[model samples]
Target: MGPVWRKHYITYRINNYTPDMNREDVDYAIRKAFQVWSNVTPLKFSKINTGMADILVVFARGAHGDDHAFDGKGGILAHAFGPGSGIGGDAHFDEDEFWTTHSGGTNLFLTAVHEIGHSLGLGHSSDPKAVMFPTYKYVDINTFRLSADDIRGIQSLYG
Candidate 1:
């Protein structure tokens, strides 16, 4: 299994918000993203604005002081660390992509769900319909459902 959180409760922080999105939208995206996993496994995520959090969320362009420097606008939209300490579960979004609450540019809400899936120690799924699918697609949020593969993966690790 990928590095699983030894505990059930997890916490995260949005270190910064994207200037391209509304404050509330960014927050909702993050909240709902965590909720996606919380709904499946025993793991729960909390958000804090102060002090260190298990996961730190941020938006940056390139060379943001990490092994993976994102390409501008198109490739490598976002990435996250697996469960651990000191940057464990941290998620970074490439600011060059126009992040959106809906389907115009990169969908922040949807992207966060995928990245958060990794933060929980799951990886890309071969199933095209899985949220863990390596490719990012704009699924209508209202109709979105976690693919069975996603549930199985998380459950096998933590549930």
Candidate 2:
């Protein structure tokens, strides 16, 4: 089983917003983004209102805290760790991009889905349609579901 598969559920919550968007909107987008995998796999993401969560989601600028630093405005907006005991399974978003709700700027929902893919022990996909795709592209918010390859990647570890 993959990192998240070993556990009954994965707990995550918003630590903050991207400065351009509200925390509630980011939270909503992140929740929906993670659903892109739960539908294909047997993973579940639980929301925590208070206290620390297993996965600490945050939006940062430049080199945040991890070794793989964000390149600022473009290139890599965020990254996540694979499942582990500590400092793992967390998601981070770059503050450089104009994070927005479906118009005007980079779609936070779309990026969240991609970053969560990494947090779930998945990597970048060569296919453009795959949610694990490394780069960014303005996509239809509702259509941000995993591709066949994405499901296969998750299943490879979980099933």
The whole-model lDDT of each prediction reads 0.91, 0.80
Model 2 misplaced regions, further than 4 Å: 1-5
| Tens digits of per-residue lDDT for model 2, 66-125 | 787888686777778888766788888888888888867788888888888888888789
Candidate 1 has its poorest 10 consecutive residues by lDDT at 2-11
TM-score of every candidate relative to the true structure: 0.98, 0.89
Give the Cα-based TM-score of candidate 1 against the true structure: 0.98
Q: Candidate 2: how large is its RMSD?
A: 1.9
> Cα RMSD (Å) per model?
0.7, 1.9
Q: What ranges in model 1 sit over 4 Å off?
A: none
lDDT (tens digit, per residue) of candidate 1 on 1-101: 86989998788999888999899989998899999899989887888879999999999988999899999989899999998899888999999999998
